[PDB]
Design a binder for this molecule. Structure first.
Ligand SMILES: Nc1nc2c(c(=O)[nH]1)N[C@@H](CNc1ccc(C(=O)N[C@@H](CCC(=O)O)C(=O)O)cc1)CN2
Ligand SMILES: Nc1nc2c(c(=O)[nH]1)N[C@@H](CNc1ccc(C(=O)N[C@@H](CCC(=O)O)C(=O)O)cc1)CN2
Lengths: 272, 272
């Protein structure tokens, strides 16, 4: 370490776009139209996503059915794993049941009853699992307070036999315009997490959160991603359709010496 | 700390452009034409530089006279301090003698006879001083080996009564295409330096080195600057004419919480 990364694993890009918070996805789900879902699956895959996040959004429909449908629909057209994005454990498990390959669970909080439910499920289905550094008492402001919750996630994951390489800790980034002070604490938390065990737990962020409902988001997203990667970030749920963002990531990845430099590294990175 | 900065000092931009390695500067110096020097002084000032680097470049002329002339010529049209960029101590001192305000000396190596000459000169003229993490044995590859030389710089500066706030340690960045492995070690060195004393020594880089004689430099420069700033960088000799670079810096500066967020932060940053 500290800033010299222990490993050289490719940065993991999790395409954010198949998420019922978006109208087109919400309506495709309403009309059970698989076309918009498959279009976004293909697009994200073509941009180099390693996982596709899958989030039902708000719905009065049975989320179990919706999640199932999304997963099957996506995996019908691309050979990519899903990052199953829900607080509903039955929605998650339904997705895991029809999922081809190793999925990612998104996510468990540091709440004990959440951990007790989600960890055995990741173990059972051999899925990676995201653990958010938060509980019912809320999201901690301080890096140190986030880190405690991180420690608690590590302990529980390990207690379920889940390897650290399968555990992705999310310190929860918040919009810089209304929660500016969090952004730097998150960086420091990422650094701390990378110290917690050997091998270390991985780290992940909902990157776009940092600019949500801010003006001129693309600059802010790509700046923060570079900062986070520097701090040790292993993965991000992010807009893989943003070419400038992915260029930024590929450049940081080279500058961290995790992939051998060549003149065509911007392309190389997207294939990896 | 660690990544949460102790302070909130504005990032220090040192305009790189008045440097005899550039033909127009070299020729302005040859013809003793003050116009190109003053033009670049004004331009850089308008882009928000806090210092202007001043480097004679290669010349068969008396560097003492050249440096004097450059400093007077620059300060004739802008109210900015100079970052006097030479290995010739008499060139440096000549510049310090005619310099208006507090200059920066660029630089001393960790060579003992260099330190013994340059440190008393900074003290005497009340100039900030850059110390490069290198000596006659060469530039160390490892962060740890760079850090030792950093430690030696701190010790000597302190032994001359120079405050840490006046000492800028340069771990020497090298082009990523031929010395890729250095870039991450430099980051780790910056982090380490920020730990060496209280208050900590400052840090600085010749940023453009990272892409020198590489294709598509602007992306690489701005990515690395963001990484370096994240690691703790306080200043950089850089191309302040590169708007994308300065946007990148301003965004990182906000994300580090060193300046209160507002929607117009890209402008705000350039005035500060
Ligand atoms: N583990 C984890 N999972 C997450 C998040 C996280 O943090 N951590 N955060 C979220 C990450 N995904 C997104 C997806 C889109 C946006 C986004 O920004 N949406 C547009 C929608 C615009 C439109 O509707 O057209 C907006 O402006 O609000 C933000 C985060 C959801 N999942
Ligand atoms: N303390 C310190 N001082 C420094 C450096 C450093 O590290 N540390 N490194 C240098 C930083 N300044 C520059 C200025 C320009 C360029 C640059 O890249 N020049 C163009 C010139 C093109 C042209 O001639 O038109 C090029 O392509 O080579 C690189 C570093 C000099 N001073």
């Amino acid at each position: 370490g500290g800033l010299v990364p222990r490993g050289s694993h490719m940065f993991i890009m999790i395409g954010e776009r198949i998420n019922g918070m978006f109208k087109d996805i919400r309506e495709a789900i309403l009309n059970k139209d698989p076309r918009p879902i498959q279009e976004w699956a293909r697009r994200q895959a073509e941009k180099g996503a390693h996982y596709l996040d899958v989030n039902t959004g708000p719905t009065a429909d049975d989320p179990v059915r919706v999640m199932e449908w999304l997963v099957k629909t996506i995996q019908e057209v691309v050979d990519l794993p899903c990052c199953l994005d829900s607080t509903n454990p039955d929605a998650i498990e339904a997705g895991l049941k029809v999922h081809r390959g190793h999925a990612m669970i998104n996510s468990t909080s540091a709440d004990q009853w959440k951990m007790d439910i989600f960890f055995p499920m990741a173990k059972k289905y051999e899925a990676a699992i995201i653990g958010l550094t938060m509980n019912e008492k809320g999201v901690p402001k301080d890096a140190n307070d986030r880190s405690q919750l991180a420690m608690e996630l590590v302990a529980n994951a390990d207690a379920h036999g889940i390897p650290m390489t399968e555990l992705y800790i999310d310190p929860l980034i918040l919009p810089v315009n209304v929660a500016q002070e969090h952004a730097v604490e998150v960086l420091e938390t990422i650094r701390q997490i990378k110290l917690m065990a050997n091998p270390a737990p991985r780290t992940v962020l909902g990157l776009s959160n940092v600019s949500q409902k801010c003006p001129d988001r693309p600059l802010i997203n790509r700046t923060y991603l570079v900062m986070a990667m520097t701090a040790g970030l292993d993965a991000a749920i992010m807009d893989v359709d943003d070419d400038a963002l992915v260029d930024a990531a590929a450049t940081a990845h080279i500058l961290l010496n995790k992939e051998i430099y060549c003149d065509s590294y911007l392309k190389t990175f997207r294939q990896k």
